[model samples]
Target chain A: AGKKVLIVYAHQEPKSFNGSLKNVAVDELSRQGCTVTVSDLYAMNFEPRATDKDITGTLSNPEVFNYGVETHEAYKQRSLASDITDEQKKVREADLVIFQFPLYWFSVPAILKGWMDRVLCQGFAFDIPGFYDSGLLQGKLALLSVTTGGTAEMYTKTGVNGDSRYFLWPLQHGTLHFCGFKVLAPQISFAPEIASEEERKGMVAAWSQRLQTIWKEEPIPCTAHWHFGQ
Target chain B: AGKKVLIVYAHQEPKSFNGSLKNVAVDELSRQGCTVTVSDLYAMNFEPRATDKDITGTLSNPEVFNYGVETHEAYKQRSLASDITDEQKKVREADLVIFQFPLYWFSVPAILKGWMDRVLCQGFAFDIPGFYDSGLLQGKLALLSVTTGGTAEMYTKTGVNGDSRYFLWPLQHGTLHFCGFKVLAPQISFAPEIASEEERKGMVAAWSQRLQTIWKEEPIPCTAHWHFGQ
Candidate 1:
């Protein structure tokens, strides 16, 4: 009852399949008396470029601009832009962070990636000594709800895409697990555009059903072996 | 001598190591009489969010938005935003496409990912029946000139992050090869931030030297075995 969820949604239209998935999460989670916040990237006209604009104060090192180093310093000094700070606040408070977006080029949309690049700075999300199993956001859970243009068949080991797990390594292990988020198994709805009306609705319903028991699930063993078999 | 090249560069600072690499490429290529066009994403303030704003005319389906379907239709109708068309024109004219950026969370920065998502739309990049080995943009050559925060040691098989080739799967195989570009081996300049002045200069010179013989290099066998190995 005290759980909080943040959906970092990145689709443009509210009526698209991605929108439906997001709405379903909110409806189901809110129905269970859990607090939910959605960072509606497109509707908010979210700034997707990570630049000096991200930092409000004078440069930490006016001579050079390394995004990782600069943003980390800005985040520490509370000198980051309001939008970035606002998202950070949401991430800080959330019990679970669910990224809802259509998979563009086998990855998250650019706007969503910008959210990750800008908000999850060194001091906030991770540091050299405090990453992976010991990151800043260790207690929080993360999930990727991805919609793809290709069918599930095309994403397998022998398929054209050569195993979906191969693609998930960067996001699951590198990004989420590196930030110490306990990653739940991804909810991938494949080829929503090509699916029949019944099939599409079924996919949406399947997500709702999964969310009903999400709390009971265990995080996957997010290791290299799990991603790439030996 | 008449070949055209497009460098999709996505770093914020012009004086940074990434800038040095990009400048070296331009200098070497221009010296050889090759026409070079750079889409400096940060300098151009490139829009990274793929939204309905990307389409200039009436919505194909105003009620529901499917990015792939709508954008494909828009391309056919010549209704995509001028900015998108401009990038497409560059790709259309270029014989080689080189992406230069620091790896953000083991992937391309949001701005460049947005370029792939928007500019390489359905009709423009591939069709349902015309993908993989027989894709639309078949003749173009693509290379990824990536900079990383991790050391070369950390990117090895026994290293913390695993092989560098593991992360290249989505970009090289899924995105670039999927769109029919002949994939070239990535030039990964590892841990430029931690390198000394001489090493940094050496890295830049190495890139310049490589560009001098870029035409002689062959495309990699972008296959499952090549990436995963037995």
Candidate 2:
């Protein structure tokens, strides 16, 4: 089969653990005849800050700047900066979107966060009347393939960092689910840096294998109870 | 209280709702005889991307970049970039750190996320054995004063967005608590742009009042049960 998958990768170095994960996804997906595009955020030097420059045309309110309002209008009028519009086009064309990155402060790196802020505009990603179950990108699928510095033991409920699912709530539920992308259960490769080379390879191999049947997976219930339990 | 405080403010427009909240906090804290410094990330044009550029003298592995390992080494040797060192200095001196920003996709805006990613490095904020209760910055208190696009009702467990505390788990428990800062209850001002002018002013005033008795408050039990249910 044929599918369009976009991997928005955020690691600074492609030689690192995250790089291997990103590489595996691409290779496996392509082997399955999937069209794969990777937005190598660090290499691209993706602008993380949302500013007046994002709106190439006139300001919605020249007197004061409001990112949400201005960006929404920009999306409507087709005047958003080329970078944002370009990414949006990729998202629009993709059937599955994979966010491959190392966890930074329990979330996305600044560059990827900036991509969400800038690319996922109000009208493009979701509308005032269209969010959650009714979101514009409802038919799409998303998965967060994250690598964390913390160990699996450290991410439990009794563990110091709390459950790993606790941290995923915002990304899986808040952002992805809000935009109507059904979130596949995340692939958490815990502390790949601390693991032996074999372990790292195993993790990457697991990722490749998973991608071989990625279309067969079901999205996790993007809910508080699902993340934290009732 | 005459205590030193750092307000890491992230907002594009100084005349917007978030700006008003930031302004009132500064004025109130200063009036109360406290030393206050503001990091207006947007105005400063803070670098959010974590790259080799962050490590000035020499990267740990120049051939293959590793952001965490490189930055940790740089911190140990005092070779971190001047900007990162500068922010770390502020955090070191502050008794309390207040993060003021509007929520982006249920998390910090990219600029502020970059601040956390770049500034709060391993050796500087926490170490392998020095996270959570044993973190280097344990004595300091941190608060997330956030503005959101969703309404309060929308953030409940049954709400479309899920409980607000579910979203706070990542920032409060994962990042702030991991760095050893006792997490204060967050100030969540929901949908300020949609609120009436008087309601917006009240939100700002309430924050000012909170700062007046800020020291007397206790840190919340940042646990899974606290965020979700048992």
Candidate 3:
């Protein structure tokens, strides 16, 4: 069986340039003979905001295994309520876990963070005390697929963006690494907001080809000391 | 007794110019006779990374009224691990909680976020299932005291910063409010890197004086319902 790729996609205007990136991702991954499950965050209208009910409700019961809480518990709770089953199982069963998003400010948008807040609950992604010892998502190969608004040079120390890449460290290193994912050097596309169709296509193709190679390679080393300490 | 104030501070360069702001805050608040407790995150070499150990540990009882095994283990471990008495006492008596930090990419630095991730664990900030019904921090007030490199104008919708104020919503409304603390409109100082000494001095004075009125006002409302549909 081919690998199952679950792309947790977050973008507001799907038809906007970000939408194109999502489409490019979906198509290319599928084309690569991977069974891809596309989580279109906006199309699902996933409520990025987690409210009092969401926080206080029994759905948030940490004791219950597979307990799920919907982000928009009112309208269509299922949207924000997506479990990491496919993503989790696929990560373990398959070969890769890719987080695809347009860089908002310096990190993934609120919906994506909300996903982490919701799906990556107490014992599932990372184990709780008596139930398990370590992270369930360990041994999973992770990749950050992102598109930035500025030129590549902007991420440099002296770039016009004033330490252009300082933003990604929090999401990439802090959150991702803290959870015990073996993080790969992210694939970034610059000036994506205004990229021509052809250029965007080329970027997607390059990333797609890179993904094919990375999917087969050894996952990046987890800096366990960062989280576990000596 | 003087009002208890807890200032959780995060800064990388303690001797740099930004360190002066820390000095001003410590001096002014203390000189005003408030009982203040400062957690200099970096000086404590506080790790920003939260790990599996932070979630839970051995000797955890799952059948208890705990949220999960981790919650049980964490509480037991925390009480035994260190003298959290100062933190517990200050928080209980606190009339105000101030999170002081330099704005890195429109949010708290990694150290601060990690400090938040670990210190503001589930049961302490919010309750775990069947353990506690309300947050330990419910009645306290929260103030986000931050310095930014960007000018005030750049934070507006039309500026290159792209809704500079929008980035703060998550920090102000989501995290703090969700945990039941009454938050305040952030005390933000802009262009600290280039501000005239006179301007900074005046700004510091203004905020210092404002504290006299702030302690009496209501916490920043739980604007969560407004943003997330109730």
Candidate 4:
């Protein structure tokens, strides 16, 4: 029962509820005899901006810097920064990829978003016709294990924030699904700061429990109708 | 007529379509007797990560770090990084805030997303009770002027990407509206890279025309019904 898992974790503090979530994933996955690698984005001091600096060698077009086009060509020519390729290697070898972070502005933190932008370039993550079901990362599984500042009640259909799924459409269907990762139902621990200590612990435990049976899980149909009701 | 507008521009290339749109906004707003400021994120190399560096003073809770709580306290103490404060000051002075960038993963680029995440902290943008309609930056107007790699047909309701509005929910409702900024409808210039040179000029010209009438525009009804229907 040996497999590889990569946790792309984004949070400033190691003691954050997000940190606890990351730790629990590591602990549980390790117990299952899985090879675990964690990219603690803040700890790594990961570069969050997608700039020309991402390319170590001379750019394909030095005069015009289109990130998507430039990064795609750089990736193919093996001119991308070693840091990007290093993460790509982990992704290539991993059977599953997990993103752990506190939701910022109803999405992943800028650091994690940068990882998606830079690391998941055209040649590496997807080609023009080779996306979605036919994506480059086809066999791999991805999950968004997120912590939110808003309570679960607030994210409901009748609640102030509407359904949490409204926000998930972009990350799940647009990004992850587009990249060809079979997406597991997200593990959302809501309002961890507002929760009691015991409730926080329960959220962590629930995550661990979910990980135990993760292999048996089926990915949700990542469709607009599934995310937003008809 | 004499209003101040801040355009938080994110793009790697100065000659890119994103850059053209940004320049058009500046010209049009300036022509309308509006003082214009452009935060060229890539040029400034804005720091995107939220970390200990954000707090100039000692952390409120060194034992357990919560970014929201720590930054909120730091803001009150005037201990936030000067760069963050500088952007906040621009937000404070602006009658309207415009974000211009090429969409990455159905959302703003990591650089722009970082701007929203870091600059719009609890105390500066909203407090626990002062969010949504009661948010701190109520009088200000916000707009996302975006360029996309996908064609308009691809983002339609029956298209491969689903309706374009599916992606707008997070930026419009979750972030800008949540912060109490009245959101102007997003100006999405789709497939600029794929467009002919003449079409590219047309896109820029259209943005300029819209900016001429931007002040007369009303904010969208940022509601669940507005974003997603029953």
* Candidate ranking (DockQ, best to worst): 2, 4, 1, 3
Better candidate by DockQ, 1 or 3:
1
Give one digit per residue, the lDDT tens place, for model 1 in A68-151.
Answer: 878888887989999999999999999999999888887888898888888889999999788888988999999999998889
Kindly report, for each predicted structure in the order presented, the TM-score of its chain A compared with the true chain A.
Answer: 0.98, 0.98, 0.72, 0.98
Q: A189-228 in candidate 2: lDDT tens per residue?
A: 9998789989988999999898988999988888777887
Question: lDDT per residue, candidate 1, B51-148, as tens digits?
Answer: 88788777878887767777888899999999999999999999999999999999999888888888998888888887877678899899999999
Interface DockQ of candidate 4: 0.86
TM-score of 4: 0.98
Give the CAPRI rating of model 1: high
TM-scores for candidates 1 onward, in order: 0.98, 0.98, 0.49, 0.98
* lDDT of each residue in B1-230, candidate 2, tens digit only: 56999999999999988898889988988998999999999999999999889988867788988888889999999999999999999999999999999999889999999999999999989997798888889999999999998899998878888888888888987889889999999999999978998998898888889988998999998767787774
Which parts of model 3 are misplaced by more than 4 Å? Answer: A1-230, B15-17, B55-73, B76-90, B128-134, B224-230
- Candidate 4, residues B123-157: lDDT per residue as tens digits? 88999899999999999999999888899999987
Could you give candidate 3's per-residue lDDT for residues A1-230 as a string of tens digits?
47776677765445545566667767777877877777776566444322323343344333422222233231132322234333334444545567777664355654566455445544445433311114456655567778776677755544433233344444544445545566777778777646787987788777767765666565444332221122
In model 4 chain B, which range of ten residues has the least summed lDDT? Answer: B221-230
Order by TM-score, highest first: 4, 2, 1, 3
Fraction of native A-B contacts kept, per candidate: 0.84, 0.94, 0.00, 0.88
Question: B113-219, model 3: which lDDT tens digit per residue?
Answer: 65554455556666543111144577678888888766888665455343444555546644566466777777777876578879877877777677756656765
